[PDB]
Structures are given as structure tokens and as C-alpha cells.
PDB file of C-alpha atoms in Angstrom:
ATOM      1  CA  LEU A   1      71.841-134.901  18.339  1.00  0.00           C
ATOM      2  CA  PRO A   2      70.264-134.382  21.803  1.00  0.00           C
ATOM      3  CA  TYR A   3      72.293-137.297  23.145  1.00  0.00           C
ATOM      4  CA  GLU A   4      75.022-139.853  22.441  1.00  0.00           C
ATOM      5  CA  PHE A   5      75.881-142.185  25.321  1.00  0.00           C
ATOM      6  CA  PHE A   6      79.422-142.914  24.131  1.00  0.00           C
ATOM      7  CA  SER A   7      81.022-139.558  23.322  1.00  0.00           C
ATOM      8  CA  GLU A   8      84.371-138.164  24.473  1.00  0.00           C
ATOM      9  CA  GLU A   9      82.515-136.515  27.356  1.00  0.00           C
ATOM     10  CA  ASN A  10      79.641-138.767  28.442  1.00  0.00           C
ATOM     11  CA  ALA A  11      81.394-142.115  27.915  1.00  0.00           C
ATOM     12  CA  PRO A  12      83.052-142.063  31.369  1.00  0.00           C
ATOM     13  CA  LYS A  13      79.593-141.544  32.878  1.00  0.00           C
ATOM     14  CA  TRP A  14      78.103-144.685  31.315  1.00  0.00           C
ATOM     15  CA  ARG A  15      80.846-147.140  30.309  1.00  0.00           C
ATOM     16  CA  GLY A  16      80.656-149.960  32.840  1.00  0.00           C
ATOM     17  CA  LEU A  17      78.058-148.202  34.987  1.00  0.00           C
ATOM     18  CA  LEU A  18      75.590-151.054  34.514  1.00  0.00           C
ATOM     19  CA  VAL A  19      78.076-153.923  34.213  1.00  0.00           C
ATOM     20  CA  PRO A  20      78.493-154.226  38.008  1.00  0.00           C
ATOM     21  CA  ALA A  21      74.731-154.638  38.422  1.00  0.00           C
ATOM     22  CA  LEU A  22      74.199-156.923  35.428  1.00  0.00           C
ATOM     23  CA  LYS A  23      76.606-159.434  36.970  1.00  0.00           C
ATOM     24  CA  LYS A  24      74.161-159.552  39.873  1.00  0.00           C
ATOM     25  CA  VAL A  25      71.226-160.015  37.507  1.00  0.00           C
ATOM     26  CA  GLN A  26      72.967-162.809  35.611  1.00  0.00           C
ATOM     27  CA  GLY A  27      73.581-164.150  39.098  1.00  0.00           C
ATOM     28  CA  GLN A  28      69.922-164.300  40.092  1.00  0.00           C
ATOM     29  CA  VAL A  29      68.793-165.756  36.767  1.00  0.00           C
ATOM     30  CA  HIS A  30      71.684-168.200  36.374  1.00  0.00           C
ATOM     31  CA  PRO A  31      73.770-168.791  39.547  1.00  0.00           C
ATOM     32  CA  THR A  32      75.887-171.584  38.057  1.00  0.00           C
ATOM     33  CA  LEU A  33      76.774-169.635  34.908  1.00  0.00           C
ATOM     34  CA  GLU A  34      79.869-167.434  35.177  1.00  0.00           C
ATOM     35  CA  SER A  35      80.055-163.722  34.330  1.00  0.00           C
ATOM     36  CA  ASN A  36      81.979-162.287  31.382  1.00  0.00           C
ATOM     37  CA  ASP A  37      82.712-158.548  31.149  1.00  0.00           C
ATOM     38  CA  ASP A  38      82.949-158.736  27.356  1.00  0.00           C
ATOM     39  CA  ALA A  39      79.271-159.691  27.090  1.00  0.00           C
ATOM     40  CA  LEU A  40      77.767-157.652  29.934  1.00  0.00           C
ATOM     41  CA  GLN A  41      79.364-154.587  28.358  1.00  0.00           C
ATOM     42  CA  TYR A  42      77.401-155.439  25.211  1.00  0.00           C
ATOM     43  CA  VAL A  43      74.251-155.998  27.258  1.00  0.00           C
ATOM     44  CA  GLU A  44      74.974-152.539  28.644  1.00  0.00           C
ATOM     45  CA  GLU A  45      75.138-151.013  25.168  1.00  0.00           C
ATOM     46  CA  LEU A  46      71.753-152.594  24.467  1.00  0.00           C
ATOM     47  CA  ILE A  47      70.141-151.640  27.770  1.00  0.00           C
ATOM     48  CA  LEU A  48      71.462-148.111  27.259  1.00  0.00           C
ATOM     49  CA  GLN A  49      70.063-148.031  23.731  1.00  0.00           C
ATOM     50  CA  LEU A  50      66.765-148.867  25.420  1.00  0.00           C
ATOM     51  CA  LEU A  51      66.892-146.006  27.919  1.00  0.00           C
ATOM     52  CA  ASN A  52      67.539-143.654  25.007  1.00  0.00           C
ATOM     53  CA  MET A  53      64.431-145.033  23.302  1.00  0.00           C
ATOM     54  CA  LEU A  54      62.372-144.404  26.435  1.00  0.00           C
ATOM     55  CA  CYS A  55      63.668-140.830  26.398  1.00  0.00           C
ATOM     56  CA  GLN A  56      62.917-139.846  22.796  1.00  0.00           C
ATOM     57  CA  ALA A  57      59.297-139.510  23.929  1.00  0.00           C
ATOM     58  CA  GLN A  58      60.378-136.978  26.564  1.00  0.00           C
ATOM     59  CA  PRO A  59      58.860-138.599  29.687  1.00  0.00           C
ATOM     60  CA  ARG A  60      57.462-136.234  32.325  1.00  0.00           C
ATOM     61  CA  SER A  61      55.283-138.504  34.453  1.00  0.00           C
ATOM     62  CA  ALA A  62      55.486-141.893  36.154  1.00  0.00           C
ATOM     63  CA  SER A  63      52.884-142.967  33.600  1.00  0.00           C
ATOM     64  CA  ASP A  64      54.295-141.494  30.381  1.00  0.00           C
ATOM     65  CA  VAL A  65      56.943-144.202  30.679  1.00  0.00           C
ATOM     66  CA  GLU A  66      54.310-146.915  31.013  1.00  0.00           C
ATOM     67  CA  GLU A  67      52.613-145.368  27.994  1.00  0.00           C
ATOM     68  CA  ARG A  68      55.800-145.278  25.925  1.00  0.00           C
ATOM     69  CA  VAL A  69      56.662-148.811  27.035  1.00  0.00           C
ATOM     70  CA  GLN A  70      53.069-149.795  26.298  1.00  0.00           C
ATOM     71  CA  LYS A  71      53.557-148.318  22.825  1.00  0.00           C
ATOM     72  CA  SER A  72      56.953-149.847  22.040  1.00  0.00           C
ATOM     73  CA  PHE A  73      57.714-153.197  23.689  1.00  0.00           C
ATOM     74  CA  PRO A  74      56.149-155.955  21.539  1.00  0.00           C
ATOM     75  CA  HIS A  75      53.343-158.122  22.966  1.00  0.00           C
ATOM     76  CA  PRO A  76      54.065-160.047  25.673  1.00  0.00           C
ATOM     77  CA  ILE A  77      57.161-158.214  26.813  1.00  0.00           C
ATOM     78  CA  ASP A  78      55.322-154.870  27.043  1.00  0.00           C
ATOM     79  CA  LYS A  79      52.791-155.931  29.673  1.00  0.00           C
ATOM     80  CA  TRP A  80      55.325-158.044  31.559  1.00  0.00           C
ATOM     81  CA  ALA A  81      57.722-155.087  31.563  1.00  0.00           C
ATOM     82  CA  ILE A  82      55.111-152.754  33.043  1.00  0.00           C
ATOM     83  CA  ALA A  83      53.995-155.311  35.622  1.00  0.00           C
ATOM     84  CA  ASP A  84      57.532-155.304  37.014  1.00  0.00           C
ATOM     85  CA  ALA A  85      58.016-151.543  36.718  1.00  0.00           C
ATOM     86  CA  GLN A  86      54.754-150.938  38.580  1.00  0.00           C
ATOM     87  CA  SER A  87      55.501-153.542  41.249  1.00  0.00           C
ATOM     88  CA  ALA A  88      58.700-151.555  41.806  1.00  0.00           C
ATOM     89  CA  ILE A  89      57.437-148.008  42.362  1.00  0.00           C
ATOM     90  CA  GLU A  90      54.905-149.617  44.698  1.00  0.00           C
ATOM     91  CA  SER A  91      69.900-154.010  41.395  1.00  0.00           C
ATOM     92  CA  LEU A  92      70.705-151.416  38.725  1.00  0.00           C
ATOM     93  CA  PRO A  93      72.150-148.158  40.169  1.00  0.00           C
ATOM     94  CA  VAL A  94      68.704-146.577  40.553  1.00  0.00           C
ATOM     95  CA  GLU A  95      70.416-143.851  42.575  1.00  0.00           C
ATOM     96  CA  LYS A  96      73.529-143.142  40.499  1.00  0.00           C
ATOM     97  CA  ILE A  97      71.242-143.094  37.453  1.00  0.00           C
ATOM     98  CA  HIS A  98      68.585-140.672  38.721  1.00  0.00           C
ATOM     99  CA  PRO A  99      70.830-137.579  38.413  1.00  0.00           C
ATOM    100  CA  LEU A 100      72.035-138.836  35.029  1.00  0.00           C
ATOM    101  CA  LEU A 101      68.493-139.021  33.654  1.00  0.00           C
ATOM    102  CA  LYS A 102      68.058-135.297  34.287  1.00  0.00           C
ATOM    103  CA  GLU A 103      71.125-134.843  32.082  1.00  0.00           C
ATOM    104  CA  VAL A 104      70.037-137.218  29.314  1.00  0.00           C
ATOM    105  CA  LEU A 105      66.941-135.080  28.755  1.00  0.00           C
ATOM    106  CA  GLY A 106      67.655-131.777  30.468  1.00  0.00           C
ATOM    107  CA  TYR A 107      64.603-131.685  32.722  1.00  0.00           C
ATOM    108  CA  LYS A 108      63.484-132.681  36.216  1.00  0.00           C
ATOM    109  CA  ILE A 109      62.262-136.113  37.308  1.00  0.00           C
ATOM    110  CA  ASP A 110      60.715-137.473  40.504  1.00  0.00           C
ATOM    111  CA  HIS A 111      62.457-140.370  42.247  1.00  0.00           C
ATOM    112  CA  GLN A 112      59.342-142.370  41.361  1.00  0.00           C
ATOM    113  CA  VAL A 113      59.871-142.155  37.597  1.00  0.00           C
ATOM    114  CA  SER A 114      63.505-143.239  37.889  1.00  0.00           C
ATOM    115  CA  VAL A 115      62.527-146.276  39.955  1.00  0.00           C
ATOM    116  CA  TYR A 116      60.072-147.035  37.153  1.00  0.00           C
ATOM    117  CA  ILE A 117      62.511-146.583  34.268  1.00  0.00           C
ATOM    118  CA  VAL A 118      65.484-148.293  35.916  1.00  0.00           C
ATOM    119  CA  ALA A 119      63.098-151.111  36.829  1.00  0.00           C
ATOM    120  CA  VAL A 120      62.025-151.480  33.202  1.00  0.00           C
ATOM    121  CA  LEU A 121      65.642-151.372  32.034  1.00  0.00           C
ATOM    122  CA  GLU A 122      66.574-154.086  34.525  1.00  0.00           C
ATOM    123  CA  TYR A 123      63.643-156.251  33.451  1.00  0.00           C
ATOM    124  CA  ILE A 124      64.886-156.340  29.869  1.00  0.00           C
ATOM    125  CA  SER A 125      68.326-156.960  31.353  1.00  0.00           C
ATOM    126  CA  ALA A 126      67.105-159.954  33.338  1.00  0.00           C
ATOM    127  CA  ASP A 127      65.062-161.011  30.314  1.00  0.00           C
ATOM    128  CA  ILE A 128      67.965-160.849  27.873  1.00  0.00           C
ATOM    129  CA  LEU A 129      70.285-162.588  30.336  1.00  0.00           C
ATOM    130  CA  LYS A 130      67.586-165.143  31.131  1.00  0.00           C
ATOM    131  CA  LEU A 131      67.264-166.201  27.493  1.00  0.00           C
ATOM    132  CA  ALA A 132      71.017-166.243  26.881  1.00  0.00           C
ATOM    133  CA  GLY A 133      71.540-168.344  29.988  1.00  0.00           C
ATOM    134  CA  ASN A 134      69.110-170.979  28.742  1.00  0.00           C
ATOM    135  CA  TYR A 135      70.968-171.079  25.430  1.00  0.00           C
ATOM    136  CA  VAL A 136      74.286-171.566  27.205  1.00  0.00           C
ATOM    137  CA  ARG A 137      72.930-174.185  29.604  1.00  0.00           C
ATOM    138  CA  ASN A 138      71.462-175.904  26.545  1.00  0.00           C
ATOM    139  CA  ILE A 139      74.813-176.335  24.808  1.00  0.00           C
ATOM    140  CA  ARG A 140      76.497-177.259  28.099  1.00  0.00           C
ATOM    141  CA  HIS A 141      78.906-174.322  28.462  1.00  0.00           C
ATOM    142  CA  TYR A 142      78.533-172.896  31.973  1.00  0.00           C
ATOM    143  CA  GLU A 143      79.489-169.436  30.684  1.00  0.00           C
ATOM    144  CA  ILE A 144      77.675-166.574  28.946  1.00  0.00           C
ATOM    145  CA  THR A 145      79.948-165.141  26.252  1.00  0.00           C
ATOM    146  CA  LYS A 146      78.983-162.135  24.127  1.00  0.00           C
ATOM    147  CA  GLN A 147      78.572-164.580  21.247  1.00  0.00           C
ATOM    148  CA  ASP A 148      76.031-166.602  23.223  1.00  0.00           C
ATOM    149  CA  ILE A 149      73.849-163.574  23.956  1.00  0.00           C
ATOM    150  CA  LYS A 150      73.689-162.631  20.268  1.00  0.00           C
ATOM    151  CA  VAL A 151      72.805-166.120  19.036  1.00  0.00           C
ATOM    152  CA  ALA A 152      70.341-166.257  21.932  1.00  0.00           C
ATOM    153  CA  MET A 153      68.389-163.091  21.135  1.00  0.00           C
ATOM    154  CA  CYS A 154      68.117-164.254  17.528  1.00  0.00           C
ATOM    155  CA  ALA A 155      65.868-167.217  18.295  1.00  0.00           C
ATOM    156  CA  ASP A 156      63.616-164.721  20.091  1.00  0.00           C
ATOM    157  CA  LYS A 157      61.280-162.631  17.932  1.00  0.00           C
ATOM    158  CA  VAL A 158      60.083-160.384  20.769  1.00  0.00           C
ATOM    159  CA  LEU A 159      63.535-159.060  21.671  1.00  0.00           C
ATOM    160  CA  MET A 160      64.820-159.303  18.102  1.00  0.00           C
ATOM    161  CA  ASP A 161      61.817-157.263  16.969  1.00  0.00           C
ATOM    162  CA  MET A 162      62.433-154.818  19.817  1.00  0.00           C
ATOM    163  CA  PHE A 163      65.943-153.737  18.804  1.00  0.00           C
ATOM    164  CA  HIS A 164      67.395-152.448  15.531  1.00  0.00           C
TER     165      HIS A 164
END
């Protein structure tokens, strides 16, 4: 039990830490669509479940992440994810998260690896939100509810096959 994001100790350190940023993301992907804490908090749970997955492989380089990502993320999302991550090291609290990473694993990490990870995490964030937004805009709703996101990720094998 090396880590549990929502315990009676760590919870305060994560709960709503990504929500503020996600609103921005959902703002760049779908300006017209309105935010909804209920959902973004769920997107957070997912994005956080992703970070944990990228940590099980105990990253120690700015490449080990690319490798892990290159080993997990289903084709096309894997390559696309890296492309972004790379183009980054070259909105999410990249700073406020860096110190946290060291605590999620218990080791040291260069500011370059964090920029890579956080970038990857945000890509899936923008990707998830991007798909959900289309769903919403398809049914003429102008709002992304938690329900929408779920039903949205379903019609997508890549993402659906990515989580469990």
C-alpha cells in the first residue's frame, strides 16, 4: 500500500488540487461550455489514478516516463501523449505538484521529469474533456456534467481501454 491518494492524511493534499486547472483546460477546449465542479472532481480522480499508474513503474528519468507511457497508453493516445509531453520539457500546477511527486514515490525528481509527467496528465485531461465536450455539444446542452463525461468516455475505446 505504497500510496492512496484519498486517505485521512493525503486527501487534503489532492482533493481539488487539479480542479482549478481543469476548468482552464475545459475552457481552452470548449469555451462556450460551462464548468461543473461535480464532474471536474471526477476527472481529477481519473487523472490522479493515471499519475499513480505512471508511478508504479518507479520513474527515475525524463525518459522512463515516456517508456512507461509508451508501454501503457493504447495506440494512438500513447504517441500523441508523448508528443505533447516532449514538446513541453523542450495549466496544471506543475509547481505545486513537483514536491508532491517526491512524496508519492519517496525519491528525488528533476524539474524536467515533473514538467513531463504533469504535461502527460494534462494531455489526458484535455483529451477526456475534449471528447466529453463534443458529446455535450452534440446533444445541445452547453454544460459538461459528470454524467456526460462518463457516457462520453464509453463511446471511446482508447480511453475506455486505458482505465479500469
